Each structure stands twice: as C-alpha cells, then as structure tokens.
C-alpha cells in the first residue's frame, strides 16, 4: 500500500515492527516465520526482518 501528499503541507508518519515473545503467536497470526517489511520513500527507505526475542 502507498500514499503521497495532496494536501501540499508536510506530513509526519509513524509505524511499528512486531517482535513477539513466542513463536505460537507468529505462526498463529501471520503464518510465516519469515519477517520482511519494506517501508519505502525516495529519500528514506528501510526493511525489517525480525525473529522472536524473549
């Protein structure tokens, strides 16, 4: 999914990257042990690939 500005003012955006404390959540909710997110812009961009950390 995506968005770009139409308002012509500047924008401030927030998001999160889930780290369960156990795997049974991870398989139950999302059904992949693989994590891969890619939050992308022109200037900034970054990916996220976590595991469970107790």
């Amino acid at each position: 999914k995506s968005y770009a500005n139409n308002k012509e003012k500047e924008v401030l955006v927030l998001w999160g990257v889930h780290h369960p404390p156990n795997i049974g959540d991870q398989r139950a909710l999302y059904h992949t042990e693989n994590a891969y997110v890619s939050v992308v812009s022109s200037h900034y961009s970054r990916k996220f690939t976590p595991e469970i950390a107790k």
Partner: single-chain antibody, 236 residues
Framework: EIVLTQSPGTLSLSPGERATLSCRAS???????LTWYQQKPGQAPRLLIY???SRATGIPDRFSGSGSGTDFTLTISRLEPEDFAVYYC??????????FGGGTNVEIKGVQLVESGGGLVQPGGSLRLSCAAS????????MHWVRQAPGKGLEWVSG???????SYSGSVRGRFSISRENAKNSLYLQMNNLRAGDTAAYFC?????????????????????WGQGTTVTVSS
C-alpha cells in the same frame, strides 16, 4: 451472524465405530472460524477441536474433522460409551457474534470460574448475576455469557471484548446489561424485563486472548474455558 445447521442432532451407534457429523451454515465462512465441544448432561462443556482440523490439549487422537466453506465437519475414528454426550458447533462471526449449532447426541448402544445468583424471579421482573475468577488474569480475555434450555439448542446471549465493543442478539439486547471488572477479577450481568424465554441454564465463559501479553497461553479463535453454569427462571 449466520444460522448454522448441525447434522444429526442425535444418533445411536455401536462401539468400535466412526461417527461423521456435519455442521454447515448459510454462507461460506473460511475455516479457522469454528470450534467443537462436547458435554455430558450434568457436566459443563469440554473443548475438543478447532478450525475444522486441529486438536485441543489433553487428548486422544480419535476425534478428527475436515470440510471448508459452507460445510464444516467433525468426524470420529472410534466410538466408546464414555463419549455418551452432546457435541456442539460454535463459531466466531465477523459480525462479532458467536453462533451455535443445536447439539448432537451420541448415544452408545450396548484456573476456574464461579457463577453467582442463579434462581427464580417473577416474569417481567429484574435480577442480576455475577461471575468471579480464580487463578488467571481476567484482564486479557474476551468474555461471553451463554444460555441453554434443557436438551435444546444453545443460544448466545452476549459477549464483550476487553476494549468495549459489545455484542448481543437483536432480541436480547437492551433487556440485559453487562459490566466487567478486571481489578476485581469478576463480572456482572444486570437483567430486566424477563420472560419465559430466559427460563434456562446460563454459563459464563472465558474466550479469546486479545492480542498481547506475557504467558505460556497461546490463543485460538475458540473458547478458552467454560464455567459450571446455573439455572435461571421466571415463574408465578
């Protein structure tokens, strides 16, 4: 949420036998969406199967199911006289409404909650029930109050998520009112305008781990655990 239909509401079969039971709905409804129970008359219900395949804790291997979409199914590998019981079919609506099959008797041929206040009122009257918790964190789980007439199909009276989204039936709503207390580890159900449709045995029920907490509890979209229930009646 959708009307279900079990298949059959009672059956009579011999030992050393399978038993196929089909709970199917109006619409096609996606499959990690149901769970499956038993109950002995006099005992509270017990949890067996969830999501049309997968199996609960403290178990043999014999009860096993299948099916998808509109037609969900639980089958049985072996029948035994210790299974002499009514089995149920309980589904979490996307409209957050549990819906119930009408119970299925197997006849074989030859931690806890605690309820509070069950009993009599006058019809058109007013009465409250409470429940209370023991040995867990009543914080987390989405709770449900449930009813049952004797040897009848269940009905789901009400339930509430821990962030306040209520769900009732359109008939029962307004006449009942709930309220929850996690610091108390207890629950309340104030009730008014009571007629013979309420003449039934009720149950308090702990359901669903909401998203997040420490624990060695996983979650399903099944119940967690029941209570022993209690009788409530109008009369004169």
């Amino acid at each position: 949420e959708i009307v279900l239909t079990q298949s059959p509401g009672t059956l009579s079969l011999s030992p050393g036998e399978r038993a196929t039971l089909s709970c199917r709905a109006s619409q096609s409804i996606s499959g990690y969406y149901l769970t499956w129970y038993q109950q002995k008359p006099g005992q509270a219900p017990r949890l067996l199967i969830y999501g049309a395949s997968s199996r609960a804790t403290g178990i043999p291997d014999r009860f096993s199911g299948s099916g998808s979409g509109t037609d969900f199914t639980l089958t049985i590998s072996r029948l035994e006289p210790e299974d002499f019981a009514v089995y149920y079919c309980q589904q979490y609506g996307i409209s957050p409404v549990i819906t119930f099959g009408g119970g299925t008797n197997v006849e074989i041929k030859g931690v806890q909650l605690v309820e509070s206040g069950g009993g009599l009122v006058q019809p058109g009257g007013s009465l409250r029930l409470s429940c209370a918790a023991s040995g867990f964190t009543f914080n987390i789980y989405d709770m449900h109050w449930v009813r049952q007439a004797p040897g009848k199909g269940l009905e789901w009276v009400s339930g509430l998520t821990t962030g306040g989204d209520t769900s009732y039936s359109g008939s029962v709503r307004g006449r009942f009112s709930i309220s929850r207390e996690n610091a108390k580890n207890s629950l309340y159900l104030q009730m008014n305008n009571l007629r013979a449709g309420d003449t039934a045995a009720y149950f308090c029920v702990r359901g669903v781990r909401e998203v997040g907490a420490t624990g060695g509890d996983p979650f399903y979209y099944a119940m967690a655990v029941w209570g022993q229930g209690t009788t409530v009646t109008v009369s004169s």
